[PDB]
């Protein structure tokens, strides 16, 4: 959990509009969020992991224990239940809400941090370099 720690800066995207229409965000509100470029700050206060994202249109932050479900409000403002576990090198997050599901894998790949999001075959890939 050392090689995730740090501030991260978005350098490529792929299908983030598609993924978002799948999670069900509105046309207008989907475009404006798609403009902005979130970063990703990841800290480790003792054993409580904090992941912040400092995008333009909305800032967000979550704090959790690895493998303990918790509640969050995601940037698109869904109220979800989610759990995050260090799964075979990656930091995998499941989010369950209104009978639906999605997975956010965060693996290191080279000096980068790759993020696969999937909701029913529809999958999006953002990439980050250490800022």
């Amino acid at each position, epitope marked *: 959990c050392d090689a995730f720690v740090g501030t991260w800066k978005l350098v*490529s995207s792929e299908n983030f509009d598609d993924y978002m229409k799948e999670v069900g965000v509105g046309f207008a509100t989907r475009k404006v969020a798609g*403009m902005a470029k979130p970063n990703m700050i990841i800290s480790v206060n003792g054993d409580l992991v904090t992941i912040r994202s400092e995008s*333009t249109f909305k800032n967000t932050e979550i704090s959790f224990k690895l493998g303990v479900e918790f509640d969050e409000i995601t940037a698109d403002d869904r109220k979800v239940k989610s759990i995050i576990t260090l799964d075979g090198g990656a930091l995998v997050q499941v989010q369950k809400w209104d009978g639906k599901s999605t997975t956010i894998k965060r693996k290191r790949d080279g000096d980068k941090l790759v993020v696969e999001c999937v909701m029913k075959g529809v999958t999006s890939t953002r990439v980050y370099e250490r800022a």
Partner: antibody
Amino acid sequence: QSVEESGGRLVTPGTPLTLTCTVSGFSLSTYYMSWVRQAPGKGLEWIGIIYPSGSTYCASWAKGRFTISKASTTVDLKITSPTTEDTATYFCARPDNDGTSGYLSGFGLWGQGTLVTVSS
Amino acid sequence: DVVMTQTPASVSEPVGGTVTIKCQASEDISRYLVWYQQKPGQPPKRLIYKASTLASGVPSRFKGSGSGTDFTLTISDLECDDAATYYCQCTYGTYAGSFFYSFGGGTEVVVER
């Protein structure tokens, strides 16, 4: 703690030209370097940056016309086929980060510029 | 291939007064934006980086604001010394196989007296 350009002179259109930044007080295996140009009475144009690993990006318009190599303690900008548009003062500069050794806080160190004049 | 757009091109203001210049990025670039001052013949000096952080030994009369696409430098207590031409630069680096280090077209400040 210092960089300095040299090699600017009069060339005729077409003949290649090499400018040279020379550094002192830091290592090129730690720091990025970049070249910026400014024609007289005009704006700053960013040419391209060179990473400590030797990798290189150039502005969109620069591709084809410039090239940036580095050595021990020099960084060279090769202008490949000068045109009269390429007449300008060529600064050399050093990007850093929040303290040092990156690029996101922009340029903290410049040379005084070397004037290139292209004309027959 | 990002492009920065300063306004206004020129502006005059009396000593002790206040100016406001503005930058607009064509894309979102987060808070990665630096402001330079250039006096004629000299190379530029870095004033403000990270959109709002003050570089070493720069007076707080200089206030950098903005985020995402629209930033503003603001100079108060305008001193005679502040007469120069101010450039804004995108310092976000890599994005999508490109590199984003472009300068603003520049804004000249005239200090009336």
